[PDB]
A paper describes a structure:
Rishirilides are a group of PKS II secondary metabolites produced by [name] Gö C4/4. Structurally, rishirilide is a tricyclic partially aromatic polyketide with an unusual isopentyl sidechain and a carbonyl group on the third ring. In this study the involvement of one cyclase and two oxygenase in rishirilide biosynthesis was investigated. For this purpose, excision of rslC3 gene using the markerless time-saving CRISPR-Cas9 system, inactivation of rslO4 gene using Redirect® technology, and crystallization of RslO4 and [name] proteins were carried out.
The monooxygenase [name] crystallizes as a homodimer and the overall structure of each subunit is made up of a well-conserved 8 β-strands TIM-barrel surrounded by 8 α-helixes. Each β-strand connects an α-helix through a short loop region. According to the structural homology study using Swiss Model Server, [name] was revealed to be FMN-dependent bacterial [name]. [name] belongs to the family of FMN-dependent luciferase-like monooxygenases. The [name] three-dimensional structure shows a high similarity to FMN-dependent luciferase-like monooxygenases such as the epoxy-forming MsnO8 which acts with the flavin reductase MsnO3 in mensacarcin biosynthesis in the same strain. The high similarity in three-dimensional structure between [name] and the epoxy-forming MsnO8 enzyme in mensacarcin biosynthesis in [name] indicates a similar activity of [name] enzyme in the epoxide formation to form RslO5-substrate during rishirilide biosynthesis in the same strain. According to the high sequence identity between RslO2 and MsnO3 (47%), it is most likely that RslO2 acts as flavin reductase, by using NADH as a hydrogen source, to provide [name] with the reduced FMN in a similar mechanism of MsnO8-MsnO3 two-component epoxide-forming system. In his turn the FMN-dependent [name] [name] is responsible for the formation of an epoxide providing a substrate for RslO5. Following the epoxidation mediated by [name]-RslO2 system, [name] product undergoes an epoxide reduction by RslO5 and then oxidative carbon backbone rearrangement including RslO9-mediated Baeyer–Villiger oxidation and lactone formation.
Numbering used by the authors:
A (entry chain A), B (entry chain B): 1 to 263, 286 to 351
Amino acid sequence: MKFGINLFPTVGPAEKSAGQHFEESLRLAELADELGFHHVKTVEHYFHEYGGYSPDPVTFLAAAAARTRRVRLVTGAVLPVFTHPLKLAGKLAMLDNISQGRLDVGFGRAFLPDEFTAFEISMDESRARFDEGVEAVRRLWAEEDVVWEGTFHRFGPVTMLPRTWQRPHPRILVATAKTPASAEAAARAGHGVMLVPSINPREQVQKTLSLYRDAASAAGFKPTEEDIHMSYNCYLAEDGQEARQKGGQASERANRALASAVSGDFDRAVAERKALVGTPDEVRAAIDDIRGWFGDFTISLQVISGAMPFEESARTMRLFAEHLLPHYA
Amino acid sequence: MKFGINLFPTVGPAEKSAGQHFEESLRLAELADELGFHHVKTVEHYFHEYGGYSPDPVTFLAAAAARTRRVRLVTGAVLPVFTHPLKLAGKLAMLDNISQGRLDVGFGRAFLPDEFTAFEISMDESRARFDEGVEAVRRLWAEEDVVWEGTFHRFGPVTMLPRTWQRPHPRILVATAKTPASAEAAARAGHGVMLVPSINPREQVQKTLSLYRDAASAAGFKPTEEDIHMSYNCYLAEDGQEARQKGGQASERANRALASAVSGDFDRAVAERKALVGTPDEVRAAIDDIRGWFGDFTISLQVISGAMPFEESARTMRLFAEHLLPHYA
Ligand SMILES: [Ca+2]
Ligand SMILES: [Ca+2]
Ligand SMILES: [Ca+2]
Ligand SMILES: [Ca+2]
Ligand SMILES: [Ca+2]
Ligand SMILES: [Ca+2]
């Protein structure tokens, strides 16, 4: 197992200024570095309290990279549908070099209707836009004199600068909450995968992993634990009932932001290992269950939410580092 | 006068790898901070050794912001013609908050044919895309529930997140199109201007400044020296021979890059005060001339070029801070 942190903002200006949010998030990235976490992840979203403080994850991750030395930086996930592959390839290549080779690039599908409407892009061909965006970026990184005759963009021969630091390029992961068939296509392409256990049933995530691992082997490709990412809301306290109360409020706040942006329950989610909330001992048992179902992979611990004090996010990370990180290292 | 540092890359891998360039440029930003320079600036350009290591200046400046405390971060310049105003406003708002209000945003006009070709933008739309892009971004920062229905984009109502740190928005500077209307339009909107003395005759710069200052007065706008930006190649050494030879190589190399991209001169440029290269006493005389011609404004000192070692860029900056910065303070 690998464990990093995810910094998904679910907050609006009435709860926390963006100035405070970004100072706190960069300090949590520093704490991830100091405590020995694997990575720092953030997201791309527009307009709503659900994710909207992060319309450009690369901008945050370049700052996080500059504040850190060893933690990896991960997009979870850039949205190729809303950018141009020349720009996406270029800014990610800059970040790879700034971070001295610590970047992993997750690419995801958009789903918020207001994002599609505002950028005047149809959902109808978003799948083709996504696949062509990923491949065009990969080609801009891997090749020179690139002639891209795409459905949505046509350019070349061109060679994108800067060239990436990593060879052939940063790891590519494809996010799928949608369809196990997209996980098969990722393996066929040699890509990693990002799954969403917090919404999908356990047996569904397992069958997606089985299809992915099967397709990967058929393509002569052995996925490591760094090729499979999943994010979990995470809140730790020495008092597990305090963790339930404050972590449950956080998960509630994020759920509400989500419901607004798309246009008993918490305890069951915790019992089903859809969220990592409790004492270090509760979360240890939960992780061991997850590892038994899914095998070894990379978890991003989502540690911020709403007006949750920085000190509580930092406590979660410190407790995880002291009590859990050593046993999986 | 104010003096900052320009970190425009005119460099390819035979001179510095991208990894070396970004490591050294971030250290120069740290040195600009330490030595008391006003700002750090970088460019947006694609494909060529002329600027092509920086397809996304916000990515670099986010890292530079994270490494520094006081120096301002200036886009010189983002190109609205190649990015959607929603994305431009969002990433810049993130950068504003990450830097805790140290951002000034210069908006530039593209001119390299290869960039227009690759992004599939007709050059005849350059003016409208620029003016509509700048204004849409300004409104996205300044207002809530923004609806924009222009020639190229239609969206809203949206409230762009994160909200900027600076209110109503960061300083906006615009490259002028040498037509009088563009300098007057900047003044009437309360924008600053970015002028190019290294290429245009002194009298042209003076005419644009007169138009800008007069239109500002008529509009009730009082521009300050921080509202007027110009870049100069800069190389200082106490040995005047070394300054001319190495500063000359640096400027000639940058001019070769530009000539490739668009398809006794250096001595003349220095004599006409279009480059700031020489001993500290020689450059002092040059700046005194420029200030007499143009008034007080903000200079970005372009201190890197090609394979010039970091320590020579650092020496230029240290000599400038010791011998010239106090005379204008
Ligand atoms: Ca603080
Ligand atoms: Ca090659
Ligand atoms: Ca080095
Ligand atoms: Ca400039
Ligand atoms: Ca103003
Ligand atoms: Ca300038």
